[PDB]
Amino acid sequence: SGYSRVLLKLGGEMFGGGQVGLDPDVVAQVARQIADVVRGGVQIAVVIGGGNFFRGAQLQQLGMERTRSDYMGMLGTVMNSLALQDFLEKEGIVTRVQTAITMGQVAEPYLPLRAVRHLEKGRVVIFGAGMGLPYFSTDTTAAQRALEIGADVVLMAKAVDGVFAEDPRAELLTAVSHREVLDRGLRVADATAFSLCMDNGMPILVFNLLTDGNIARAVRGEKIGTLVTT
Amino acid sequence: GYSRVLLKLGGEMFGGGQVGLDPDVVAQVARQIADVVRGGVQIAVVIGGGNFFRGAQLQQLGMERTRSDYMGMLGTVMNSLALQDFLEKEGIVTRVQTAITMGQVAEPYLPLRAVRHLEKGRVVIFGAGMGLPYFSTDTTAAQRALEIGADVVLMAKAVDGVFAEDELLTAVSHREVLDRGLRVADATAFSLCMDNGMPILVFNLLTDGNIARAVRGEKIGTLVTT
Amino acid sequence: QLSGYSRVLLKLGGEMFGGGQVGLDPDVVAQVARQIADVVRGGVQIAVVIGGGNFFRGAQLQQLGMERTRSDYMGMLGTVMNSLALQDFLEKEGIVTRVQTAITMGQVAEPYLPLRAVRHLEKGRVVIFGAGMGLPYFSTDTTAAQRALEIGADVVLMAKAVDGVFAEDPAELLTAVSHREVLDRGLRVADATAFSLCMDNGMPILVFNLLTDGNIARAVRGEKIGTLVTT
Amino acid sequence: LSGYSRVLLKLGGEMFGGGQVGLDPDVVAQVARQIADVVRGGVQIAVVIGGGNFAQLQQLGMERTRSDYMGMLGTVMNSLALQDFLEKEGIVTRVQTAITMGQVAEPYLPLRAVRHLEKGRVVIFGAGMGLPYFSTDTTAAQRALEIGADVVLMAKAVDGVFAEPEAELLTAVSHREVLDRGLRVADATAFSLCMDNGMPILVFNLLTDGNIARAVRGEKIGTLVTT
Amino acid sequence: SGYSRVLLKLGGEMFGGGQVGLDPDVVAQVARQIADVVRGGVQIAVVIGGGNFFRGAQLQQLGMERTRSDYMGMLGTVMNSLALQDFLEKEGIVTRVQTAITMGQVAEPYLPLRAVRHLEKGRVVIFGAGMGLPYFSTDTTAAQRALEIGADVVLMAKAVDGVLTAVSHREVLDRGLRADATAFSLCMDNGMPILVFNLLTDGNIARAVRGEKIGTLVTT
Amino acid sequence: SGYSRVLLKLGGEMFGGGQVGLDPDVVAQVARQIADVVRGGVQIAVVIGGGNFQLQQLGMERTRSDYMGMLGTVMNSLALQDFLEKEGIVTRVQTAITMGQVAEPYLPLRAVRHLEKGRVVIFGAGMGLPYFSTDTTAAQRALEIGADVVLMAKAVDGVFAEDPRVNPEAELLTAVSHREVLDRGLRVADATAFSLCMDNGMPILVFNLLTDGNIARAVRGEKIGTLVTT
Ligand SMILES: Nc1nc2c(ncn2[C@@H]2O[C@H](COP(=O)(O)OP(=O)(O)OP(=O)(O)O)[C@@H](O)[C@H]2O)c(=O)[nH]1
Ligand SMILES: Nc1nc2c(ncn2[C@@H]2O[C@H](COP(=O)(O)OP(=O)(O)OP(=O)(O)O)[C@@H](O)[C@H]2O)c(=O)[nH]1
């Protein structure tokens, strides 16, 4: 008894897989995994970060205002999205990109009602350029997009396949509540992103995506990673 | 003293409420923002839109949350346009920037523009929230305050401050508000402020001179710093 | 060739929305949604223009000291409040409804694209034209006229608080008059500018009381109630 | 002499080609020179042109709506032509269009339009009001009101409005009177707009050079409809 | 052979006669020709010039900025586009008008991905307002749009039958044969074919789209 | 006989130095060179390429690849803007693709206005059209603003008289005509961009920005690089 639609959050750093820019192998793994989800019947939107595109940084510890570096990140996210679109399309998966800041020529504008329409036709929707606002993390973009599209859950792709009870200098939980996560003293996401989720009862699912087969199992409701709930 | 502030108000303040828009309150409020400005302070303002909803009928009655949100955002703009007029009448040059671009109605959201407006000695009213549902006016206020590099978020309430808990407190840390166990603002709004170290001063605007009291550094309503 | 009107611009006043008072009384809105729904189900095409008196004219605020242009936009914003409310209710009636705003408000609704509004109509969806025409110094009645024109409406339906146009300010109720006859028998106020626009393009106007349940349906049916203004 | 701080001049598009299709460079230079007379006299001036110089199309099929958009685009071409000729006469001019058209011209923004007028620039408003079924007359009205104009100058081809042998030209008439039988100074919509707002209209003969400058000083020119 | 999809470039200077303005007997006759091409199952995009609304080059001679001229031309091309659209719709051909300068409800934004979608639905697409940029000819707009919609050939409508029946891109450079230089380079660098043919002689469009030996082909 | 306003073209590759992304040494160096020119009273607009962020040789469709590049050029612009500003120079970025908060709309008349106030204008996002080089974007914008010259930064300080693959021991030019460039196979810019310039009498000056003082020499009218004039 799993999920009908989900929002998947990838960090920008993932796409470069250390180092800077795009490792087209990594992005291939991800497209392939996202396809398994589509074919499994489930509807998926993706929110990607933009970290892979500066050293770094470097830019900030080095002069740049947060405001400007956030806009650079947003532009990064949109490069990430177009690359992913392309790998998904060669995978047979029809994909659309909507950008928070409207970039007429490059992609579609952010219109959640049209996005839902896309999902309902078995298209992946990718959400680029965050929320178009400095001071919000990708996590927070993820939470809010999951809400707008009415996602059943926000799938958080980490490198750790769950959430450890206490730092291991230890077993990772399978399922904890929102209050438990906050109430001494864990860290699933950025606090702001977590607040949005908590105040709206959005389930978060922390898991490793690059472990082949994870996401298709996750979306079947198959107890992988750590499910935050209430 | 505070050099530049974000003043936040719930839409219901503009109701003197009562529902809708009371002009003597808008007048009163523009009169006092006018004093703060003539004093040399820079002021960005953020108003909610709650005063145009009868309590919460249609939200209850079955409106999509997203559609309520947008109705509220339209509310904010109606309040913004109103305040603009009463300030201009008060002699003070006022711009309205909307998160939702509404061509002729107001300027678009341009943070660098807004700062340049402020340093030219104008008021900037930020309207339509952030154009994004599932976010409150307090969150709009926080983000806007961070963008424009404001010293504090002033939260004009119809209460003297923050208590514990209906014993009005006077100074607390951000950390201290979480651990037990207060409500200064929206959960999501508070986090944004805290994750960035942004001060928040909660005071009663209903007693005259309180905004002036607040900005010039007088103590106080409840200040929250970390 | 079918009977009554095929597509129709329904002009609804904002005060009637309303109460009563400032803002929105959902019972009124819900009642109006249901009547519109019945008419739509039978395959009449309806586009709606809503007023803003429950929030602001005008016009009004100009007198009060406020800047006219600013005040007009507040009124137009008020009409988008109403437009979203009516949308929510029509939906709950099982009627697909689209709001097009004259002032693009990206996230909030669709832009004003009239050829697309007509496509909506052809698919059996109601379209609510909000934000007026987006042009200060104009009223919603003129919006109603203009929009009727763009979408090739058969008639403007003026749903007022009284049952038609009377000969002289109050009887009698005139069932049928000319656009010209209105200025000849000086039968203000249906809004001169809005009226002139309909007169210059031979756009029929039916003025009728919406407060009597079932009256919209009668209007649409080519049934003789209120006042039909032609030309 | 009374006279006007700020005015809106309305021109029919057909005049610009007069009377061949497209643009007559003499006529446009003649119009520019009169407008420069107005800015020389220290009066602020906004202009609204029609687009008829570029509806037999309706005759053989075309939707009125689509024909109207065609005209709207014509008005912008006319606006651009007049701007150019004004710039030659040393007059700084901006064009704002009702429908935003990006790099071709400024968006329509009344408060910025008056900021230009205050700086002594000419503003030209194009693309009607961006909506079919409205006349150029009506656009002129609506724009005049938005920019807080003192009058709408209707450039016309006759000296004004008569009671006609030879008889008297009407120097000054009330709105109520024009209406109360039975003259057209603008179309009913345009005229209605002005009357509900107390907006004067001055119908005059642009063809005689010196006239608009005489009008704006407050000299007795043409037919003033007050108000 | 055939062409599955083709971009047809029309000089504005033919929608008038010219004389100056719009000649409906010429626009209607062009709609007619395009309608056959559509009915016969080909997908076609149109790029139109704006020169029929100018009086010689009177304005440019009198000191008009190119910038401002080119902008006048663009608005010209939108005028022609809407005329053609109208005449095509009267022929039962569903037609959409995309403008490089976005123009609200006058016509659609330039969005080549939906252009291709309109095409796939049988619709005709007319591109107006050039590329929304001065210093670029109609030929260049023709080339680029041809490239963006993945067209098979640029059909260059002319008053002369061709240039000669078939050549390469380099041969044209070598010999010195005459489209606009900058336009031609865009096509050469992407191997885009160009068919210069005489739109005037009737039925000549329906010939080209069936791969028939007509005019001049600049396939490399 | 110096120049009053100039359009400086900068290759993306430049900014990488010569790895992926942004080297804040290379950009600081470029910023100062430009700051020397502005302080001098000369007016300068800048057009930046996007290479620093091969993939089309991986299936990526041309159109989409071009947009990747354009997005890169906006990143570069914002980076240069940050360095110019900290060099004391007020600078505005205009993007061919409209990006709300990120930069300005492309609006040349407004750009000229910025140049007259002694501000630098950086033109980002190419011309928002696929199938068009950076050189072409520079040629077009140069003409839009009424530039005197396109300044064309290359690490080789000139144009060879013959292709070095035909004559290994060529040999730099100092001055040539546009025709002289055309007949032959001289190598100034790509074909499309050179046509724009030649047909409009736009001079192009090829020179090496990275040796200090070189741009200052160029704008003053000193004999520097290769100058193509008709
Ligand atoms: N609705 C709307 N109004 C605008 C916009 N941009 C400028 N304005 C208005 O234009 C008017 C004049 O201001 P600007 O032209 O921007 O010039 P400024 O930066 O304010 O400086 P000044 O020249 O002293 O006026 C003001 O009333 C602004 O509100 C806009 O994008 N939308
Ligand atoms: N993203 C974006 N930023 C803008 C836009 N317009 C102005 N800005 C920014 O706003 C800030 C202040 O500029 P303005 O108040 O608009 O006036 P300005 O033209 O930049 O400066 P002056 O002409 O001297 O008054 C600048 O730092 C600009 O970067 C815009 O349309 N988009």
Ligand SMILES: Nc1nc2c(ncn2[C@@H]2O[C@H](COP(=O)(O)OP(=O)(O)OP(=O)(O)O)[C@@H](O)[C@H]2O)c(=O)[nH]1
């Ligand atoms: N807020 C807003 N919503 C829009 C806008 N454009 C489309 N939508 C919404 O997107 C949803 C999906 O429909 P669309 O993608 O517009 O196309 P459609 O023709 O209405 O739907 P189909 O019948 O599938 O063709 C509808 O609810 C529209 O109202 C817009 O510009 N703003």
Ligand SMILES: Nc1nc2c(ncn2[C@@H]2O[C@H](COP(=O)(O)OP(=O)(O)OP(=O)(O)O)[C@@H](O)[C@H]2O)c(=O)[nH]1
């Ligand atoms: N195409 C187009 N041009 C614009 C737009 N906004 C401004 N411009 C042009 O830019 C040039 C310079 O004007 P601005 O930078 O806006 O400032 P300004 O109005 O000249 O104000 P001051 O120079 O301080 O008097 C003028 O030629 C304007 O017409 C626009 O939105 N579109």
Ligand SMILES: Nc1nc2c(ncn2[C@@H]2O[C@H](COP(=O)(O)OP(=O)(O)OP(=O)(O)O)[C@@H](O)[C@H]2O)c(=O)[nH]1
């Ligand atoms: N001017 C302008 N017209 C538009 C725009 N979008 C759509 N239209 C018009 O609206 C009508 C198309 O309706 P759509 O529903 O969007 O067309 P579609 O993609 O085939 O889907 P359906 O018509 O719903 O079956 C046509 O007349 C279009 O020309 C726009 O952005 N600008």
Ligand SMILES: Nc1nc2c(ncn2[C@@H]2O[C@H](COP(=O)(O)OP(=O)(O)OP(=O)(O)O)[C@@H](O)[C@H]2O)c(=O)[nH]1
């Ligand atoms: N760049 C860009 N592409 C767009 C935009 N809107 C639609 N498209 C593209 O146009 C192509 C066809 O889209 P549409 O014409 O809207 O059709 P659709 O919405 O996908 O849905 P159907 O045609 O009903 O199946 C897609 O590849 C879209 O990405 C836009 O705003 N910007």
Ligand SMILES: O=c1ccn([C@@H]2O[C@H](COP(=O)(O)OP(=O)(O)O)[C@@H](O)[C@H]2O)c(=O)[nH]1
């Ligand atoms: O095109 C329009 C449409 C309406 N409005 C404003 O919106 C207000 C409310 O509309 P209206 O007066 O028609 O409301 P109603 O009388 O129908 O309740 C008007 O008073 C105007 O101020 C406007 O300025 N232009």
